Amino acid sequence: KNVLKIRRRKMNHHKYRKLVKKTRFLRRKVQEGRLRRKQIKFEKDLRRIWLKAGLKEAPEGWQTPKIYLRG
Amino acid sequence: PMKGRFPIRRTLQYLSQGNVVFKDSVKVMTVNYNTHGELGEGARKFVFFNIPQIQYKNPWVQIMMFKNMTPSPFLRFYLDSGEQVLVDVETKSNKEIMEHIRKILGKNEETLREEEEEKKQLSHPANFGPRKYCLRECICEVEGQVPCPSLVPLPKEMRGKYKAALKA
Amino acid sequence: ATLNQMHRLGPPKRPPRKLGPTEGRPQLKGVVLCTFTRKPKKPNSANRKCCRVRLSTGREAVCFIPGEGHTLQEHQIVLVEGGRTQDLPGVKLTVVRGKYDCGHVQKK
Amino acid sequence: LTQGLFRGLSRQETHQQLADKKGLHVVEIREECGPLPIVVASPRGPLRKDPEPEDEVPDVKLDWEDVKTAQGMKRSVWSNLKRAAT
RNA sequence: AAUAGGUUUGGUCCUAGCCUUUCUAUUAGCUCUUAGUAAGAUUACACAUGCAAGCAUCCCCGUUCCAGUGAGUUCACCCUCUAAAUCACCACGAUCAAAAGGGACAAGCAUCAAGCACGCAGCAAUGCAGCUCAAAACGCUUAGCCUAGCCACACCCCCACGGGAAACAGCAGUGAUUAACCUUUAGCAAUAAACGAAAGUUUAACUAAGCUAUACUAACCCCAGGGUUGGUCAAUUUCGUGCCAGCCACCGCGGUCACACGAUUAACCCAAGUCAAUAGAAGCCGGCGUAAAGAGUGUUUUAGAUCACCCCCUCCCCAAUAAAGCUAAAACUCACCUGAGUUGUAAAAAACUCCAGUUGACACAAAAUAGACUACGAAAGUGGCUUUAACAUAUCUGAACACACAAUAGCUAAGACCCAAACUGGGAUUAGAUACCCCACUAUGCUUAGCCCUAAACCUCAACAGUUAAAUCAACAAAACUGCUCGCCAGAACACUACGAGCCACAGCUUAAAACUCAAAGGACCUGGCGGUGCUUCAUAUCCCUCUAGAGGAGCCUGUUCUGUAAUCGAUAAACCCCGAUCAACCUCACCACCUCUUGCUCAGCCUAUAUACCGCCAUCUUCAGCAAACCCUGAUGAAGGCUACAAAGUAAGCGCAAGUACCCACGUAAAGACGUUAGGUCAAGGUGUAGCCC
RNA sequence: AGUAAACUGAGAGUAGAGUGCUUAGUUGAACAGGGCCCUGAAGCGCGUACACACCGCCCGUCACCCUCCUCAAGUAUACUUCAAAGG
Numbered sequence A: 001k002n003v004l005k006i007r008r009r010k011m012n013h014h015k016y017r018k019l020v021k022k023t024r025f026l027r028r029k030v031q032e033g034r035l036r037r038k039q040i041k042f043e044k045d046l047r048r049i050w051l052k053a054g055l056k057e058a059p060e061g062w063q064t065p066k067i068y069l070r071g
Numbered sequence B: 001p002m003k004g005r006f007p008i009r010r011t012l013q014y015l016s017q018g019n020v021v022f023k024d025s026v027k028v029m030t031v032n033y034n035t036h037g038e039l040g041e042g043a044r045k046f047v048f049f050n051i052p053q054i055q056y057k058n059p060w061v062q063i064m065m066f067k068n069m070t071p072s073p074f075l076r077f078y079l080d081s082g083e084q085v086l087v088d089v090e091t092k093s094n095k096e097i098m099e100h101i102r103k104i105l106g107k108n109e110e111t112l113r114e115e116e117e118e119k120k121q122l123s124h125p126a127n128f129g130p131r132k133y134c135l136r137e138c139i140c141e142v143e144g145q146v147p148c149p150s151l152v153p154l155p156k157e158m159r160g161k162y163k164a165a166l167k168a
Numbered sequence C: 001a002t003l004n005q006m007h008r009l010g011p012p013k014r015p016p017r018k019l020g021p022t023e024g025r026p027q028l029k030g031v032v033l034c035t036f037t038r039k040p041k042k043p044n045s046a047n048r049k050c051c052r053v054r055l056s057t058g059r060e061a062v063c064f065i066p067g068e069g070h071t072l073q074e075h076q077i078v079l080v081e082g083g084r085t086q087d088l089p090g091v092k093l094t095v096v097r098g099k100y101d102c103g104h105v106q107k108k
Numbered sequence D: 001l002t003q004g005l006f007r008g009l010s011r012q013e014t015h016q017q018l019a020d021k022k023g024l025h026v027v028e029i030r031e032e033c034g035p036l037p038i039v040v041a042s043p044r045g046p047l048r049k050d051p052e053p054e055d056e057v058p059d060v061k062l063d064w065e066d067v068k069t070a071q072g073m074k075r076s077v078w079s080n081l082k083r084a085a086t
Numbered sequence E: 001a002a003u004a005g006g007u008u009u010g011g012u013c014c015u016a017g018c019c020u021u022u023c024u025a026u027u028a029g030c031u032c033u034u035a036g037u038a039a040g041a042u043u044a045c046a047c048a049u050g051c052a053a054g055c056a057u058c059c060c061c062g063u064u065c066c067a068g069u070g071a072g073u074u075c076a077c078c079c080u081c082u083a084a085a086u087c088a089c090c091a092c093g094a095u096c097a098a099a100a101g102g103g104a105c106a107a108g109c110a111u112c113a114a115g116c117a118c119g120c121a122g123c124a125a126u127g128c129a130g131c132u133c134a135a136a137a138c139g140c141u142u143a144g145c146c147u148a149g150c151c152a153c154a155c156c157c158c159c160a161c162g163g164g165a166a167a168c169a170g171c172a173g174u175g176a177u178u179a180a181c182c183u184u185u186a187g188c189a190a191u192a193a194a195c196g197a198a199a200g201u202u203u204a205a206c207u208a209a210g211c212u213a214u215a216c217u218a219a220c221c222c223c224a225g226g227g228u229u230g231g232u233c234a235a236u237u238u239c240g241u242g243c244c245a246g247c248c249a250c251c252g253c254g255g256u257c258a259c260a261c262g263a264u265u266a267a268c269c270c271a272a273g274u275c276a277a278u279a280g281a282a283g284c285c286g287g288c289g290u291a292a293a294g295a296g297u298g299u300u301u302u303a304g305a306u307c308a309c310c311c312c313c314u315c316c317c318c319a320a321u322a323a324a325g326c327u328a329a330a331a332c333u334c335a336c337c338u339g340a341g342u343u344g345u346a347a348a349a350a351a352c353u354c355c356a357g358u359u360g361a362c363a364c365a366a367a368a369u370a371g372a373c374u375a376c377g378a379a380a381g382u383g384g385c386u387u388u389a390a391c392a393u394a395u396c397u398g399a400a401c402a403c404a405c406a407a408u409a410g411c412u413a414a415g416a417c418c419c420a421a422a423c424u425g426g427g428a429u430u431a432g433a434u435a436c437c438c439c440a441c442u443a444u445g446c447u448u449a450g451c452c453c454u455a456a457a458c459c460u461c462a463a464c465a466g467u468u469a470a471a472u473c474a475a476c477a478a479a480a481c482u483g484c485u486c487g488c489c490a491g492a493a494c495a496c497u498a499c500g501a502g503c504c505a506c507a508g509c510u511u512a513a514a515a516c517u518c519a520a521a522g523g524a525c526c527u528g529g530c531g532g533u534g535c536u537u538c539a540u541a542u543c544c545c546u547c548u549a550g551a552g553g554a555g556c557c558u559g560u561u562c563u564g565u566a567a568u569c570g571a572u573a574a575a576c577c578c579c580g581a582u583c584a585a586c587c588u589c590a591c592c593a594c595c596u597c598u599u600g601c602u603c604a605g606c607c608u609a610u611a612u613a614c615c616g617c618c619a620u621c622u623u624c625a626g627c628a629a630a631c632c633c634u635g636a637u638g639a640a641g642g643c644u645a646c647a648a649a650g651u652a653a654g655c656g657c658a659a660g661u662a663c664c665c666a667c668g669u670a671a672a673g674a675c676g677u678u679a680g681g682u683c684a685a686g687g688u689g690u691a692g693c694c695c
Numbered sequence F: 001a002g003u004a005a006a007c008u009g010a011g012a013g014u015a016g017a018g019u020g021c022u023u024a025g026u027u028g029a030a031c032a033g034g035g036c037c038c039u040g041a042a043g044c045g046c047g048u049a050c051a052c053a054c055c056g057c058c059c060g061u062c063a064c065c066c067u068c069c070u071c072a073a074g075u076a077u078a079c080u081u082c083a084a085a086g087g
């Protein structure tokens, strides 16, 4: 069999890797922004739980951790 | 072709060929059989060929199977009164098993004939209505009666358009 | 697939039929925005008369004007139907000749 | 299609070939003739005395299209259409 | 999808999508005679006006129904229990049927995978920590439904005390809006409902009419239209147009003979309709080596299977894995002696010159031969030596995610460093050379400790059990199948992508769509062409060298190209170029300028266009030996193919070669030289099709 | 091989006109072996995404255009949910 199907995928992958390399500083700023909104969306979900259960503040001694940071 | 061995089992014709219709007392039927052994061969064919036919005729009876729990195969029926009926099936063929349970817990041909007759009373031939429920929709379909105006226009004298015209 | 697998997956699910440019409607009312000509893709050669209309749904689309000669102008009302113009890529609507402001083709 | 058709039609077993192969009568049952048994072929050689074994359930492979049609589950706007006499 | 059909290619077969043919509904165009019947806002948007609930000796009863709509949407069904209601009144009853309890009950999306109190016990107090969920919980989106009918809603705030606010989703009617467009009729005579003891009364329910080809039925002296006519697919004459104008559902048509465009003629189909657009009807038991698909490996769970008892024949050893230790060959380095160069190769340059050769000492690197063996391990992987530990399971199947692994590259940290080596630098090549070639050196390859989790992780062939007979089988590949199970696939491309989610991953990995687009994409073959394609054998004035005389340099002759001129044409790579011409001062002559003639030397004329309409006569391979009717056979009766002489499917008329003939022989030279190739040359030898000119 | 080379004559066509063409004759050699990079051919093979057939097909950057989609700072608008509760 010829490799024409492979060649189409080969060029797709080459152009994608080159695009990512050319815009890696913009994508890094976008990724940072998404992880922040992701952390906020997670904090809202936990706050919805204790508010709907009748509590006015988080359980005593609870601190929502940052589960999406590199550290 | 249809998948599996003996695909005839997965046809409505085959499933309706069961002759075992349990009495109203039967509530549960457990089947204990062994996967191997020459003396449990009839019980394996019973599970393979007949259980679908029994369940089809008795949709509300619970049927539960159990494999290799005891040395010999047997059936056990649980009745609504709390009575339990044990049936030893070791050495018997699947046809002898079907004939046995039919005799002790199946409705006879007389009881089944009567039930079918009481159903025919629900579709009275003299009633008029939709084809789904009645033979004829309107009396105009009966020969000799005044036919439907959609097929045979009524005389001008039998129409209100000209009764009111003459009267008015 | 085996009988167990077919039972577990259930009956097949047709892909939800996609609505065309008319959004599943016989015709649509439109307002002419501008007229122009389009070149067909090879091996055809012509200057096919088209127009851009604002459909009653708020969407703007290009429509082919069939027949020899038309008098459509901006701000005129037209009725558009389905049917793609085979050699005009992207043109999927056709003006109805003889309805609203678009009159019938003049004989010869 | 042509080559396959001629292969199938040329490799069919007549009723006389079936009677000779099994040494039994080939009896035909017609619904328009009621329960009247119609013998269509008899073995030219001796006639067996032992009946053909009656398997309670045949292990024959079924065609889903035939089964689906017999159960009224076959729905097609193109089947059973009226056509000119052929 | 069917009794199927059209469309992928130069061609065949396979696979596959799209479309055609059938039957309905709505809308649009054009058209339209009658009668009967059925049915009849696009919009839960806003509504002018009229009417739609009364009855009856006052109390009551009714106005909670009917009629309407489809916004919302598992309150509709079965069982248990039990109100209200009917049976005048009680009915320990029947009928009917709420609330409550149990059960059952739509679609799509798992890129919605976890929900977050969703349980149980106890008389209570209170105790336990459970409950639902990949057999789909939780969630989002869509939708009235299972139609003698049912459910839901009744302007909105799910509800309606309250609030917003002032209500046709009752009938008729109107505004706005949509492709979507019925009368501001009559009567309570029939039936149904309300009320009354009753005669009765009321009712936009209903009944009888009005409007409308949406449908059905029937009919008509006069009165037919619409669409089609390249193929699929029933049916076109003459003109116009000339890739323009336009046309098609698909394939396609139109570039001067257009059955495909427009007009016209005729024909075909249906017919008071026709059929353009839209929508619906019509679809899982087929597959996964190469077309989409066996997802890198193994284990188990809940389960499934019958391959588990019977009933049996490959235990141990060879290159599994981990740890520790070890070293034969070859390097590196150092030292002595010797040489003056060493390195690089198609050939150079650069590089080194504490360089090279012999000898000796000398690894945190890598493991000739054995191996023509075919073993070990789940796979990845594993082939120097020794030792220790050590290679799961007495049924099978069982996961992208659980659990544990997983070449190379790569990341983090600390070490080792012979050699190799991305990058980088230098040298060379080249139009350029960010390459291929040469040199140098780094990350890296090694060890240790952690990560990363990918592969053409492919023997592209899932595990287990069984068969070699039948139909052996599209093609190729590695013969064809059966049982059972899990995984996966459903035109191409978008896309190893976007988004979401998870992850020690931050230019990453895993999972993985849609819109716009096309009518194909794809798999395997056949023939031809081509190959800076292999082997073998060749060219006899012949491809190269060899032999002889020349051309290419000078002058002249002559052709051609350019330039010039008011001033022909044709040939114009081999196969044009002293060629058509065995021939131009006028003539020839077809050219240019000027002047003249018009039934004209001709029952006219044209050297006008088209050699890509042609005959005629030729160039070219050919300094060839092949061409081929009619048959036969092979390939499963596919495109196609057809020979072996100790012969295995080919037989072949005819044509060409050959043979004969001419010239001085039988030699040589002429002549001859098929079918085809270059739409090769010639419309200007002559003739001529088509088109054009005719003071 | 009576070839190449050299030399000489005649003819066709014109009224005349060629260093051209056609043709007769005279003198009269050298070498002839080896080889396959190049041109081309034959036999047997291999490959092929070309078939308008290698003067083929074909890939990407950039420019120029219509269609669709995604990301995205700040801001605005609309919608959903709450009482399925507590005193």
Ligand code: FES
Binding pocket: B138, B139, B140, B141, B147, B148, B149, B150
């Ligand atoms: S259906 Fe009976 S009168 Fe019309």
Ligand SMILES: [K+]
Binding pocket: C043, C044, C045, E243
């Ligand atoms: K064209």
Ligand SMILES: [K+]
Binding pocket: none
């Ligand atoms: K097809």
Ligand SMILES: [K+]
Binding pocket: E055, E056, E061, E195
């Ligand atoms: K009253």
Ligand SMILES: [K+]
Binding pocket: none
């Ligand atoms: K109603």
Ligand SMILES: [K+]
Binding pocket: E070, E144
């Ligand atoms: K609704």
Ligand SMILES: [K+]
Binding pocket: none
């Ligand atoms: K409501």
Ligand SMILES: [K+]
Binding pocket: E188
């Ligand atoms: K009445």
Ligand SMILES: [K+]
Binding pocket: none
């Ligand atoms: K119409």
Ligand SMILES: [K+]
Binding pocket: E367, E384
């Ligand atoms: K070794």
Ligand SMILES: [K+]
Binding pocket: none
């Ligand atoms: K892989």
Ligand SMILES: [K+]
Binding pocket: E456, E458
């Ligand atoms: K492989």
Ligand SMILES: [K+]
Binding pocket: none
């Ligand atoms: K070839």
Ligand SMILES: [K+]
Binding pocket: none
């Ligand atoms: K010719």
Ligand SMILES: [K+]
Binding pocket: E683
């Ligand atoms: K000529």
Ligand SMILES: [K+]
Binding pocket: E683
């Ligand atoms: K001519």
